């Protein structure tokens, strides 16, 4: 139930990935099913902070291509726009989740 918030989830992800060491790559995987997000603050500042802390975000959306998720994936993956994945059917979700386990 409720109305999802990308910024709160990304802020707790940033907090959780603060104490991990620098040799360990910090990654965030988001299974975002909605099409709109409600944020308590500016999400572009959160994207800037995620880029500045070298956190890579890959988002597997469920319905369509949301702009903020695409911009977040493009910014946190050094310009690569291929980290925003939208599925087709039941088997493509297995394909995406099996692709996601590779480093």
């Amino acid at each position: 139930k409720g109305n999802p918030s990308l910024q709160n989830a990304l802020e707790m992800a940033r907090g959780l990935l603060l104490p991990v060491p620098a040799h360990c790559t910090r990654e965030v995987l988001i299974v975002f099913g909605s099409l709109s997000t409600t944020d308590p603050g500016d999400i572009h500042q959160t994207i800037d902070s995620l880029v500045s802390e070298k956190i890579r975000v890959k988002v597997l959306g469920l319905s369509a291509q949301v702009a903020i998720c695409k911009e977040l994936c493009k910014a946190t993956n050094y310009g690569d726009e291929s980290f925003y994945k939208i599925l087709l059917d039941e088997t493509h979700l297995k394909e995406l989740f099996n692709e996601a386990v590779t480093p």
């Binding site: 709109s36 409600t38 944020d39 999400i43 572009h44 959306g61 369509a64 702009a67 903020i68 291929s82």
Partner: protein, 752 residues
Amino acid sequence: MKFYIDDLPVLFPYPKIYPEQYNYMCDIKKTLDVGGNSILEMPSGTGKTVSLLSLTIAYQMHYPEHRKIIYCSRTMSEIEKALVELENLMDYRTKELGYQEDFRGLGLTSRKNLCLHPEVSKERKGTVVDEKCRRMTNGQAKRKLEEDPEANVELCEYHENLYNIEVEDYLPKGVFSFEKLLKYCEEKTLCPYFIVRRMISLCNIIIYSYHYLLDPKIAERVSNEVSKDSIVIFDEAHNIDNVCIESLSLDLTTDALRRATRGANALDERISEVRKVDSQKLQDEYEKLVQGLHSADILTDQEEPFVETPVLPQDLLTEAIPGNIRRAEHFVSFLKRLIEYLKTRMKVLHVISETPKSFLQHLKQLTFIERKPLRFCSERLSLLVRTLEVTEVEDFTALKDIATFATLISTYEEGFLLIIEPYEIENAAVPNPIMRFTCLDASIAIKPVFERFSSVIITSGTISPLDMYPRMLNFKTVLQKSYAMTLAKKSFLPMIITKGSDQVAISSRFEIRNDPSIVRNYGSMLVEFAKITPDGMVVFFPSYLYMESIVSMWQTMGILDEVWKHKLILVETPDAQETSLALETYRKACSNGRGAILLSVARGKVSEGIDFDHQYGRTVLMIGIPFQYTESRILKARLEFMRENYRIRENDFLSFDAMRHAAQCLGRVLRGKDDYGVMVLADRRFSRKRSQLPKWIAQGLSDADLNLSTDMAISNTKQFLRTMAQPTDPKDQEGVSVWSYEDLIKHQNSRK
């Protein structure tokens, strides 16, 4: 890149080019070589502006004739967009050639958008901004300050700093968009408006609105300062005829005539005071009027007439003043009795439609006023206002309207009409009569453009049908073609909704706006699309009153309550500042993923010029076909005139106008071939007009997609937004939808 079209090197500012841009470039170069006029349709999404500017600059530079370039747009926003694309093109040309060549690119607009004076900036009207700038920069203020340094008159330092530098030393070489020009003139403490108005003749390329080429009130300097053999480009010209109407129309109310009487009384008091004090300032003007000196021969170049010339410069008489209005008091009495005749013509109980010749004949029979003093009335009023040196001219302002009227209906006799209505609006209890002098012939304003210039390039995104415009505007075209955009996958999904979810027919006719059932259908449709739309909606309504009614019924019932859960509701307001703030808030809400819906009207401010590229336009919801209000006498008179002269049917022209407005609303949304978005049209009358749509939208509109309901429209939108989000194969679009350099050379060799 850098490629070749015949003997012309074109510097394209991107590493890749679309095939439609190359065909556009070939046709433009062929048109400029052979001469004559042309009408071209570039589908949106493609870089129409950048390709057009690229070949036009290359054609100017490489050929030794060095023809100047006129880029007319329909709005200031697209003027700024064209200047930004010009900045990118010129930066690429400088980078490729290694040097900054001799180039001048300046945009033109009113003083209100080019004023840096800290006091006259917050005025919501451009008329008072122009008036204050004239008062502080007429040159009379400068000489009164020189004669009396202790006077209370003030000068603008931004204008006075321009006298210390030469014309070629105003700005450095290059291009200057309004943001960069405003920043440079703020840092250098200069006035950008006078810089542009004095560098009109020195510019290689200049971009201004249609009015500066069509409205003769402000075109009298711009058309003179531009060379005759220049390239002329009309960008988004599909509405240009309406601009022609706005060039040569005027409205007078009872309040306007009362203010005209007050201004006439103030002029009488002022002329009595001046006659009491100093009669030489009238005697010199009188003796200058004896020999036959006109307004331009007496007024200097640095000062302008108080009332603008409202007719074409070719239709102004070169003969002397007839002498009925030569004396100041005689002209005051002439103007006063003309105003009282108009006030007498106001009192009527039925709508009177009549020709200018009948108006002049009835005017002459009722009072002794001839056509010849009327044809010089505006020039005489401007001369009288100049020679009196009145400091405050606000109570004269509405008086200018009368002079405009006195110059319009007197000089032309064919193709215009006068409509006198006892009711301005039907719902008012008190009668409020209005008088509309109306342009019916759209070709009379644009005829000097086609006769003065040798070759024009009419280009709009969604101008259809192509052959309507050479009939509606009296000019010939050497070539007409509308390109079909080539796609690896269907980028845009035009859909037509004729019935709602419960298979009830839906429409946007004005008399059925109160029907609950179509409100139910539109509400359920908009809620479902807003539930499925990813980023941001643009919704276009046929009228603002219809918009008010449908929003009130949605808010009373609770339709908007479900919309508020997903997307923020943002509304166009008649106040331009609030509408611009709502537009910026809509863009910000689309950017951060909150989601927003922009409810606007198809014939308003938002539908023209403003783009909805990428995430700002994931859905275009066209609520109903945008017909005008048919029972208005202006539209019926124009339809009758076009039926008489241009043999166009009334219903055909109404369908053409509604479909061109809906077409530009659909065409505002694509920029780039990766861009996607559905174009849903919610009316039962759209499906019969599929041939009147632009051919790229038509070929994107499949035959199975004419008579959808709501539910399977939602399913089709779901499937389309699921498929468009996938990463496309670069092999599937490597040489069919976009071209590299080697693909362009291969296609050139295959064509040879």
